[PDB]
């Protein structure tokens, strides 16, 4: 399939070269698998999602996305216009509150609910979840990270936004789970994302165009949005059968375009997510 005009973050994971505007990708698209977008909610109306985003938990009044954040990342993982599995299940955890901002106990009890609530989804191709959250380190939020990836979750967390080595933050410190930094159009790090020996993988990550609440749209940066990408990815290779849930993250890095970032620290991966799709 080949999507014209397509965000610039989308062409690139498809793409061995930046500066292309289609997105290639198979037409499964995502379809049987689900991703868990533990954010700040999904507005599931948006009719970018089409009836495939839904919200099943929240820990505050409401849960729906009064800020904008989780929706932009659940249209980057599968929405039809903006989203890398666009037939994929989106379900919406809200563990930020609207301001974006959550404590690490709902944020830990968050992912030990999608642990098991997706013993409740059908999700034969497999699980995925997208933490586009982040704070300083934490051996409690790095370990309910830890049980949700093995629990038979692909976990991807952003790298965060710091500019640092990712070490002192969590849960982008948690090894066994999948630490995405960012990328801009032009194959430079982002001059916000994190790096260091714990990331293992960089997706798109400046100027992302998403779905926005009030069924509206907007481009925003951050590693939270290279987040989705690699999220939406896995559950697009998980559908194709290249990768398991335990494996997804290494294969994508070991699929991932080679040495073609600029401006990556020493001793961090030169990796980027790629679905290596052949049209």
Same mark, same amino acid.
């Given at each position: 399939a080949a999507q014209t005009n397509a965000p610039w973050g989308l062409a690139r994971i498809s793409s061995t070269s930046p500066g292309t505007s289609? @997105? @290639? @990708?198979?037409?499964?698209?995502?379809? &049987?698998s689900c991703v868990y977008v533990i954010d700040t909610g999904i507005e599931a109306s948006h009719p970018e999602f089409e009836g495939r985003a839904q919200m099943v938990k929240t820990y505050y009044y409401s849960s729906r996305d009064g800020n904008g954040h989780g929706t932009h990342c659940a249209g980057t993982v599968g929405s039809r216009t903006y989203?890398?599995?666009?037939?994929?299940?989106? $379900? &919406?955890?809200?563990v930020l509150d609207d301001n974006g901002s959550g404590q690490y106990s709902t944020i830990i009890? &968050?992912? +030990? $609910?999608?642990?098991?609530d997706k013993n409740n989804r059908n999700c034969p191709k497999g699980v995925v979840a997208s933490l586009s959250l982040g704070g300083g380190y934490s051996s409690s939020v790095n370990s309910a990270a830890a049980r949700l990836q093995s629990s038979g979750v692909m976990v991807a967390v952003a790298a965060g936004n710091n500019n640092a080595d990712a070490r002192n933050?969590?849960?982008?410190?948690?090894?066994?789970?999948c630490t995405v930094g960012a990328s801009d159009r032009y194959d430079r790090?982002?001059? #916000?994302? /994190? @790096? &260091?020996?714990?990331? +293992?993988? $960089?997706?798109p990550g400046t100027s992302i165009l998403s779905t926005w609440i009030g069924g509206s749209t907007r481009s925003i940066s951050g590693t939270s949005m290279a987040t989705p990408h690699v999220a939406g990815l896995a559950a697009y290779?998980?559908?194709?059968g290249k990768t398991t849930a335990a494996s997804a993250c290494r294969y994508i890095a070991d699929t991932a375009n080679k040495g073609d970032?600029? /401006?990556?620290? #020493?001793?961090?991966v030169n990796l980027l997510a790629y679905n290596n799709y052949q049209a």
């Open positions: 289609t @997105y @290639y @990708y198979d037409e499964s698209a995502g379809q &049987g989203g890398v599995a666009k037939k994929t299940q989106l $379900f &919406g955890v809200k009890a &968050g992912m +030990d $609910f999608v642990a098991s933050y969590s849960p982008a410190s948690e090894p066994s789970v790090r982002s001059s #916000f994302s /994190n @790096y &260091g020996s714990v990331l +293992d993988i $960089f997706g290779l998980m559908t194709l970032l600029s /401006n990556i620290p #020493f001793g961090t």
